């Protein structure tokens, strides 16, 4: 970097870009799967064992 | 330029939405019973109880 | 003119070191300029984020 | 018979477009350090 002296990092540009739109097709891509009469459900189980059956 | 799309999204979201008001379907027109019956059976599929849509 | 050494540059160097560090923020905050200039997510470090375009804020 | 009310297609359009545009306006981001 050197100039702006933030204690952060810094993206600008496409690259930003680019990764917000992933993170976005990520969300998409859990869902993707539980949509219209042929879709099918979903497991969860927590770190001490609760277990959530949903779609 | 991002306001360029920002801008004809607008547009397309608007004029869509003033076009949906044409494939509307009164459902006094329809037998009122029936049309509650078919949409909450529409709403049931895909979940668990689905195949028991009528009960 | 024939005399008058100056024997000290730190004071030089602490200008252009401020020099420096005005123009960077300058160049920092160009991009938000105008009816076709763009916004900026501020992340804190407790986790809020921010979305914004006024200057004065980022 | 395959039916659904019609504010639910307008609702989410609607929704839809206002996470896109708010979104797609982003050029910088910015993260800080934990203290």
Known sequence: ?55 | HPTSVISGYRLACKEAVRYINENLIVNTDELGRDCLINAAKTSMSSKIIGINGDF | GKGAYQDRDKPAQIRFSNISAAKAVADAIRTSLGPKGMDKMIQDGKGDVTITNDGATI | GVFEPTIVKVKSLKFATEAAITILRIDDLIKLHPE
């Open chain 1, 1 to 55: 970097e050197g100039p702006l002296s933030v204690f952060g990092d810094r993206s600008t540009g496409e690259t930003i870009r680019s990764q917000n739109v992933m993170a976005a097709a990520s969300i998409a891509n859990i869902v993707k799967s539980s949509l219209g009469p042929v879709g099918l459900d979903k497991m969860l189980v927590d770190d001490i064992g609760d277990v959530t059956i949903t779609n």
